[PDB]
């Protein structure tokens, strides 16, 4: 899926990272050094996530729980406990 | 100090746990299975704490920060970041 200034301005599904080349992913090429948006580095200082705080990203191997907190592991990342960037599932 | 039904009906200092014997603490006999009030099990799902949500407990090894949130580690528990149930170094 395309996204970003190169892809047309779409947002990635499950709010994944849009690389600078305009493609969606969740690995370093997309989320680290060559990320354009919803980058690992864009996680709020307070680590909250969700619609309440405008759907910000979470860092590497961290997901946005359904309670609105970024963090890692099943409790944040496994289905129904996870709202986006889910990665455990 | 004394708290709860056996101890006067007060809340502990630093909103710590009141055991079933009416004494204040922060270890498992106080906060765990034999806890009467402000127990580890009473953390709100939304993780809020502070007086605007009526001084809820925080879970185990979590502290209420000055920002109104329960969580683990130095953002919530360290000296100047913590308002109650503070414990980290
Ligand atoms: Zn939670
Ligand atoms: Zn932090």
UniProtKB/Swiss-Prot annotation, chains A, B:
<feature type="disulfide bond">
    <location>
        <begin position="12"/>
        <end position="24"/>
    </location>
</feature>
<feature type="disulfide bond">
    <location>
        <begin position="17"/>
        <end position="31"/>
    </location>
</feature>
<feature type="binding site">
    <location>
        <position position="1"/>
    </location>
    <ligand>
        <name>substrate</name>
    </ligand>
</feature>
<feature type="disulfide bond">
    <location>
        <begin position="49"/>
        <end position="64"/>
    </location>
</feature>
<feature type="domain" description="Chitin-binding type-1 2">
    <location>
        <begin position="46"/>
        <end position="88"/>
    </location>
</feature>
<feature type="disulfide bond">
    <location>
        <begin position="58"/>
        <end position="70"/>
    </location>
</feature>
<feature type="modified residue" description="Pyrrolidone carboxylic acid">
    <location>
        <position position="1"/>
    </location>
</feature>
<feature type="binding site">
    <location>
        <begin position="19"/>
        <end position="30"/>
    </location>
    <ligand>
        <name>substrate</name>
    </ligand>
</feature>
<feature type="disulfide bond">
    <location>
        <begin position="82"/>
        <end position="86"/>
    </location>
</feature>
<feature type="binding site">
    <location>
        <position position="47"/>
    </location>
    <ligand>
        <name>Zn(2+) 1</name>
    </ligand>
</feature>
<feature type="disulfide bond">
    <location>
        <begin position="35"/>
        <end position="39"/>
    </location>
</feature>
<feature type="disulfide bond">
    <location>
        <begin position="63"/>
        <end position="77"/>
    </location>
</feature>
<protein>
    <recommendedName>
        <fullName>Lectin 1</fullName>
    </recommendedName>
</protein>
<feature type="disulfide bond">
    <location>
        <begin position="3"/>
        <end position="18"/>
    </location>
</feature>
<feature type="domain" description="Chitin-binding type-1 1">
    <location>
        <begin position="1"/>
        <end position="41"/>
    </location>
</feature>
<feature type="binding site">
    <location>
        <position position="67"/>
    </location>
    <ligand>
        <name>Zn(2+) 2</name>
    </ligand>
</feature>
């Amino acid at each position: 899926q395309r996204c970003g200034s190169q892809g047309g301005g779409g947002t990635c599904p499950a709010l994944w990272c849009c690389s600078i080349w305009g493609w969606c992913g969740d690995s370093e090429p997309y989320c680290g050094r060559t990320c354009e948006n919803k980058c690992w580095s864009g996680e709020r200082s307070d680590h909250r996530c969700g619609a309440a705080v405008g759907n910000p990203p979470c860092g590497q191997d961290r997901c946005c729980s359904v309670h609105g907190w970024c963090g890692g592991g099943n409790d944040y990342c496994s289905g129904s406990k996870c709202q986006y960037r889910c990665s455990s599932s």
